[PDB]
Amino acid sequence: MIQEQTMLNVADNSGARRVMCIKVLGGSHRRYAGVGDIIKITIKEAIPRGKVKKGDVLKAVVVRTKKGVRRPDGSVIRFDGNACVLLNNNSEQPIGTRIFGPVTRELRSEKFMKIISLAPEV
Amino acid sequence: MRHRKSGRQLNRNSSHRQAMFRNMAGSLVRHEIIKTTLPKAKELRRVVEPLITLAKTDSVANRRLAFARTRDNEIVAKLFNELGPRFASRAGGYTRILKCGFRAGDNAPMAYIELVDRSE
Amino acid sequence: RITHIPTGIVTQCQNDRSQHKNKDQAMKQMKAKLYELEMQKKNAEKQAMEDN
Amino acid sequence: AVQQNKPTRSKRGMRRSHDALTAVTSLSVDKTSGEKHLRHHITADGYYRGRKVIAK
RNA sequence: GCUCAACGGAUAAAAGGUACUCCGGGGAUAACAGGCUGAUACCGCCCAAGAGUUCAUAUCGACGGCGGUGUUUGGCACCUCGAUGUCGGCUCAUCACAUCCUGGGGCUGAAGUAGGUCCCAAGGGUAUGGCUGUUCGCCAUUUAAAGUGGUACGCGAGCUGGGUUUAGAACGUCGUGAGACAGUUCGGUCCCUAUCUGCCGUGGGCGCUGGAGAACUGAGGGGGGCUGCUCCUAGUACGAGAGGACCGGAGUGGACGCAUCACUGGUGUUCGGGUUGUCAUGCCAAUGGCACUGCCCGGUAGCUAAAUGCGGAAGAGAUAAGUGCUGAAAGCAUCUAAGCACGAAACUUGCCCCGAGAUGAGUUCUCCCUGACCCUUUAAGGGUCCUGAAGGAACGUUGAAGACGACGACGUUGAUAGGCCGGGUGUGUAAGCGCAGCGAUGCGUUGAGCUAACCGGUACUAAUGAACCGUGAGGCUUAACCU
RNA sequence: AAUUCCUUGUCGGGUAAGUUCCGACCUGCACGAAUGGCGUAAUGAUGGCCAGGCUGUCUCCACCCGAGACUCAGUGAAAU
RNA sequence: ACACAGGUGGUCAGGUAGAGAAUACCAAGGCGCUUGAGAGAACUCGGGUGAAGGAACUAGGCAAAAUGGUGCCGUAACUUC
RNA sequence: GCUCGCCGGAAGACCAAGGGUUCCUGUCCAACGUUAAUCGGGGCAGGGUGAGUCGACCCCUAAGGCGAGGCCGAAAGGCG
RNA sequence: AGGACCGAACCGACUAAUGUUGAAAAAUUAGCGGAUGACUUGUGGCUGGGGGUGAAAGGCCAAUCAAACCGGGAGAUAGCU
Ligand SMILES: [Mg+2]
Ligand SMILES: [Mg+2]
Ligand SMILES: [Mg+2]
Ligand SMILES: [Mg+2]
Ligand SMILES: [Mg+2]
Ligand SMILES: [Mg+2]
Ligand SMILES: [Mg+2]
Ligand SMILES: [Mg+2]
Ligand SMILES: [Mg+2]
Ligand SMILES: [Mg+2]
Ligand SMILES: [Mg+2]
Ligand SMILES: [Mg+2]
Ligand SMILES: [Mg+2]
Ligand SMILES: [Mg+2]
Ligand SMILES: [Mg+2]
Ligand SMILES: [Mg+2]
Ligand SMILES: [Mg+2]
Ligand SMILES: [Mg+2]
Ligand SMILES: [Mg+2]
Ligand SMILES: [Mg+2]
Ligand SMILES: [Mg+2]
Ligand SMILES: [Mg+2]
Ligand SMILES: [Mg+2]
Ligand SMILES: [Mg+2]
Ligand SMILES: [Mg+2]
Ligand SMILES: [Mg+2]
Ligand SMILES: [Mg+2]
Ligand SMILES: [Mg+2]
Ligand SMILES: [Mg+2]
Ligand SMILES: [Mg+2]
Ligand SMILES: [Mg+2]
Ligand SMILES: [Mg+2]
Ligand SMILES: [Mg+2]
Ligand SMILES: [Mg+2]
Ligand SMILES: [Mg+2]
Ligand SMILES: [Mg+2]
Ligand SMILES: [Mg+2]
Ligand SMILES: [Mg+2]
Ligand SMILES: [Mg+2]
Ligand SMILES: [Mg+2]
Ligand SMILES: [Mg+2]
Ligand SMILES: [Mg+2]
Ligand SMILES: [Mg+2]
Ligand SMILES: [Mg+2]
Ligand SMILES: [Mg+2]
Ligand SMILES: [Mg+2]
Ligand SMILES: [Mg+2]
Ligand SMILES: [Mg+2]
Ligand SMILES: [Mg+2]
Ligand SMILES: [Mg+2]
Ligand SMILES: [Mg+2]
Ligand SMILES: [Mg+2]
Ligand SMILES: [Mg+2]
Ligand SMILES: [Mg+2]
Ligand SMILES: [Mg+2]
Ligand SMILES: [Mg+2]
Ligand SMILES: [Mg+2]
Ligand SMILES: [Mg+2]
Ligand SMILES: [Mg+2]
Ligand SMILES: [Mg+2]
Ligand SMILES: [Mg+2]
Ligand SMILES: [Mg+2]
Ligand SMILES: [Mg+2]
Ligand SMILES: [Mg+2]
């Protein structure tokens, strides 16, 4: 359950440390965000000379939720720590190159083909 | 609601119910028949029968578990020596509920809970 | 409040107690701020004229 | 939350319509002594279902 | 001899504050709302110069005019001053259509996509936050859209009290001063168990025409009615390119509602275990009590969500705006006058629920009762003895039923509940003893012991045989068939 | 500014967004020097604001334990 | 006003843990509060716990939740030192 | 009478203050006790408080009061 | 040493909830401030109605205060109800 005001981690090679979800994109009155939903975040903390900077607003996709994602057999892949991957605001095109932190098979939907390809595990 | 929640609250603390049903089970064993309301009778039936169930087999271990419950050796001595042998072959209801009347004070439907086989 | 449709400048006034009285003052202040916008566009083209 | 007009005796009686008591009226005679008592209740001295169950 | 100029002159002679206020009265007179009105406000329309490259009416629209609405600011005091409590927020809404989105169309300065405008349409839906006490508004990020209003600018006998109009204090300003300010600032008691109406649920009585037990039809009514994106059609139609469909059909989500615990989790003070302090069980050992369940860690059933299924519809009838056929009045033309055919999430059904107190009280099936004597102003009368049926109720053991009644199951011709037994689940290697060790403690016996409402069996305990109520073939008139 | 009506003034900082807040400019409606002016370490059940932590305050409640509520027996009010 | 959760000066004041007359559990002594018994709805009050998030609540972090002891290390701006 | 639960720097045990028989015994239940009531700080009758050492009184005195004469004041009276 | 610090008694009363025909005509529960002093408290006195007293609110002076309570003037007066 990633919703507004949720402080996510970052899981790519872009520069940020703590982001904060400010809007769950997708629909009216939409409560939370889940598996691979696109969300709008803001950057609260970064590395000094990196690409993104503090106080910037761009999109993201959730990858690892603390509540976890259900597989069709009744199994759950409960992670430990909320994390996301920064995206370009104007297109799919993830700004990262080194996606750390193993992601889920539930992102394999052809618009995130670059995400799974750069991912270490699962 | 309370769908399938077999247990009666009796308008008391949970710490009161563990000590009320401890002393009332104790005076049922020392005596043989006591007088109380039905909602205490239907519930004391749920505590005293698991003692007569217990004392059918004597052991050091069964004396302890029968001493954690009822907390007095005199009841423990009344158990394992009297009741265990007196209810040995019977497999089931070791006590009987029997409705009598009402109290003058608060009009509570009362009943005489009694241990079976008291024709001595 | 007096909000200009093409421009977007807002002109509010809550000095007096009547809506009829605050209307003319807000119309007056809007009349000032719209004409003074025209005097800056007159100077903006004038300043670019001097830049050549 | 008080009241507005005083109700009548009519309203006071129609409300006590269902407050009316009801008796048992159908007792059981025991097999031994026959002393009438309530169904599923012991007698005055200890008889029940044709048996002295008070044992005293 | 008096600007006794307030000039029929109350004295020869007289200024203000009160938010510390009090008293007597007033809706004779204000503030809040309602009411009458409709200048202003808001909406629509009329004539039409001009703008629009050409062209008044694609879209706007000068100089002027005519109305509507009761949403603004006001006017009038009609209503209340032996009380009508006030903005905003929370909650719960409900109706109107001058409609923000979706739906159906005309026109276009409509190629396509995307828009502008007007008409029909109210079924449903109709943001989260930063700042302000604010509604509004500005801003950020969305969404199919984040409509406009009525409803005491809905809602304080439902909540809050931030703002504002009690008592304290200060600053700026005004005044000699007390004090004062559509200036400001910090702080400051929000009462009530619901008689009636209304509404949400649930029963008792009686009626329904002999009574009773079940199953339905069905008038009436309520609930439900939202929608995005991706893909196929096709990157076809259109287009110099750039870009990029209608229609039709699949799949996957958000919001909302119904339902359910098999899954994932939550709680689980009736289950198991760990541990601190202290008292007690004669003492060690082993336990119990108390300290919010002492604090904790897990956890059965049940309940429930964030979990899991499902739902809106299709189709039909009759229509709105609108589009056509044939076609006269008017030789023509023309959707309309006769007649005919299409045409929306709206209307009536289709889906689901309530439902014969629908007093117009329905229908079908089945079961049970076919006993004798008197009086009488002799009538659908009253009374007595003999039987009191089907069934119901009461009582009892209780339910995943439930505030209480009620409703469902069962009542030994027994499985309804408690207990017991097997199993399962949970917690976790109990107690006692033996061995190792100075000891705490560990290992072995042992995945054992204990096991809550869980599952399947079993009459051991309790549901005692009776009694109570309810009856004895069911009126009058008439018609139609049997005789 | 406990002071600025105009006004949420303008510029800068904090925030994705800041009518409040901090620094500054000076057009001070209507600051100002014992009805004291400007600073100031500490202090404060003081006013405003921000961050970390933390959590049912909230998204959106769910369950549980007790006292009333509900039923029965006794007593038995009140405003109106 | 009552057999009223209120007010009322001084003195004595044990054991274990603890810095303590704090506080917990007990001793001696004194009491269970002068209505009770069932049922286990909504709702109200006193409390417990909680998935993911963590002020998004709101006038305002109000209330809760949290921090909490001893020993030691270490401890900024500014300052009237 | 037997278990249980509460207090235990008090809800324990003594005095002052202030009340005034509420103390104890026999007996009674209408009224009083927010219920019943055999019971009770309730009704009726009876009994109960024993001091050279405790307290008061008493001796002395503070704040202060009264105050022979006296001063003062229409009187009352004030002050000492 | 200190109108020093943390913190019971004692005193005081800032926040919230409950309660507001309450248990109580201002209290209770969970927190909170002071807590060797400008402190608090017992007993006994003194100051009094246009007067007392006041770390000053026009607060307090027997549940009453921008002028207490009781009796008398007095059946005040009331163009008001
Ligand atoms: Mg009770
Ligand atoms: Mg306990
Ligand atoms: Mg009644
Ligand atoms: Mg004159
Ligand atoms: Mg003032
Ligand atoms: Mg008045
Ligand atoms: Mg008006
Ligand atoms: Mg032209
Ligand atoms: Mg015009
Ligand atoms: Mg109106
Ligand atoms: Mg008006
Ligand atoms: Mg008039
Ligand atoms: Mg009116
Ligand atoms: Mg188009
Ligand atoms: Mg908000
Ligand atoms: Mg807003
Ligand atoms: Mg309101
Ligand atoms: Mg308050
Ligand atoms: Mg129908
Ligand atoms: Mg319908
Ligand atoms: Mg082509
Ligand atoms: Mg496309
Ligand atoms: Mg679980
Ligand atoms: Mg637990
Ligand atoms: Mg336990
Ligand atoms: Mg021990
Ligand atoms: Mg104990
Ligand atoms: Mg703790
Ligand atoms: Mg758990
Ligand atoms: Mg009829
Ligand atoms: Mg039956
Ligand atoms: Mg059988
Ligand atoms: Mg069973
Ligand atoms: Mg072991
Ligand atoms: Mg154990
Ligand atoms: Mg077992
Ligand atoms: Mg700024
Ligand atoms: Mg000046
Ligand atoms: Mg000054
Ligand atoms: Mg001066
Ligand atoms: Mg000063
Ligand atoms: Mg300072
Ligand atoms: Mg202070
Ligand atoms: Mg903030
Ligand atoms: Mg009653
Ligand atoms: Mg009492
Ligand atoms: Mg008392
Ligand atoms: Mg001690
Ligand atoms: Mg003792
Ligand atoms: Mg409860
Ligand atoms: Mg908690
Ligand atoms: Mg706090
Ligand atoms: Mg706490
Ligand atoms: Mg203590
Ligand atoms: Mg006596
Ligand atoms: Mg009595
Ligand atoms: Mg007496
Ligand atoms: Mg002597
Ligand atoms: Mg003297
Ligand atoms: Mg002389
Ligand atoms: Mg003299
Ligand atoms: Mg304290
Ligand atoms: Mg006088
Ligand atoms: Mg006179």
Taking an 8 Å cut-off on Cβ atoms, the answer to whether D40 and B99 are in contact is yes
Q: How far apart are CA D36 and CA D45, in angstroms?
A: 12
Residue pointed to by tokens 């199994």:
A75
Residue A36 has φ and ψ, to the nearest 5°, of -140, 35
Distance, Å, A29 CA → F68 C1': 40
Question: B34, B37, B98: best mutation site toward chain D, by most D Cβ within 10 Å?
Answer: B98
Residue C11 and residue C1 in contact, taking contact as beta carbons nearer than 8 Å: yes
Q: How many angstroms separate the CA atoms of A10 and A12, rounded?
A: 6
Resolution of the experimental structure, in angstroms: 3.2
As a whole number of angstroms, the distance between CA A104 and CA A34 comes to 12
Whether there are 3 or more C-beta pairs closer than 8 Å between B and C is no
Query: What's the one-letter identity of residue B82?
Result: E
Looking across all nucleic acid strands, the nucleotide with the smallest C1' to CA distance from residue B108 is G37
Q: Which nucleotides of E are covered by protein (CB under 7 A)?
A: 40, 72-74, 125-129, 137-138, 140-146, 157-158, 182, 192-196, 203-204, 253-256, 263-265, 269-270, 281-282, 286-291, 293-294, 301-303, 306-308, 393-402, 417-421, 430-432, 449-454, 458, 460-468
Instruction: Give the containing element (helix H, strand E) for B69.
Output: none
Interval between CA C17 and ligand 5 midpoint (Å): 26
Q: Which of B89, B88, B87, B92 is nearest to B118 (CA)?
A: B87
- Going by their DSSP bridges, the two strands A6-10 and A83-86 should be labelled as parallel
User: CB-side exposure of A87: number of CA atoms within 13 Å?
Assistant: 21
Experimental determination approach used: cryo-EM
β-pair partners for B96: B114
Residue of B nearest to D47 (CA): B100
Q: For residues A41 and A59, give the distance between their C-alpha atoms in angstroms, rounded to a whole number.
A: 6
What is the C-alpha radius of gyration for chain B, rounded to an integer number of angstroms? 15
Q: Which two tokens stand for residue A25?
A: 């994109």
Measure the CA–CA gap between B91 and B69, rounded to whole angstroms: 22
Is B72 within 8 Å of B26 (Cβ atoms)? yes
User: Closest-CA residue in chain B for D49?
Assistant: B98
Tell me if residue B35 falls in helix, strand or coil: strand
Other CB atoms within a 10 A radius of the CB of residue A58 amount to 18
Q: Return d(Cα B102, Cα C43) in angstroms, integer.
A: 105
Phi, psi (degrees; rounded to nearest 5) at C30: -70, -35
Residues of D engaging B, defined by a Cβ cutoff of 8 Å: 40-42, 48, 53-55
The neighbouring-strand residues paired with B35 are B112
**CB of B58 lies under 7 Å from some atom of strand E:** no
Structure tokens at B95: 């006590």
CA B114 and chain centroid, separation:
9
C21-38: burial string, b at 16+ Cβ within 10 Å, e else: ebeeebeeebeeeeeeee
- Report the b/e string of A88-110 with b at 16+ CB within 10 A: eeeeeebbbeebbbebbebbeee
Q: Which residues of chain D lie closer than 8 angstroms to B100, CB-CB? A: 41-42
Distances (CA, A) of A118 to A33, A64, A122: 23, 15, 11
SS3 A102: coil
- Other beta carbons within 10 angstroms of residue B38's beta carbon come to 16
In angstroms, what CA-CA distances link C39 with A55, C32, C43, C44? 38, 11, 6, 9
CA–chain centroid gap for B49, Å, is 6
Residue-range domains of chain A with CATH? 1-122 (2.40.150.20)
CA of D9 to C1' of G45 (A): 38
For residue A64, give the nearest of A40, A87, A83, A37 by alpha carbon: A83
Q: Where are the domains of chain D?
A: 1-55
Element of type H or E holding B64 = helix B60-68
Rounded to the nearest angstrom, the minimum Cα separation between B18 and chain D is 29
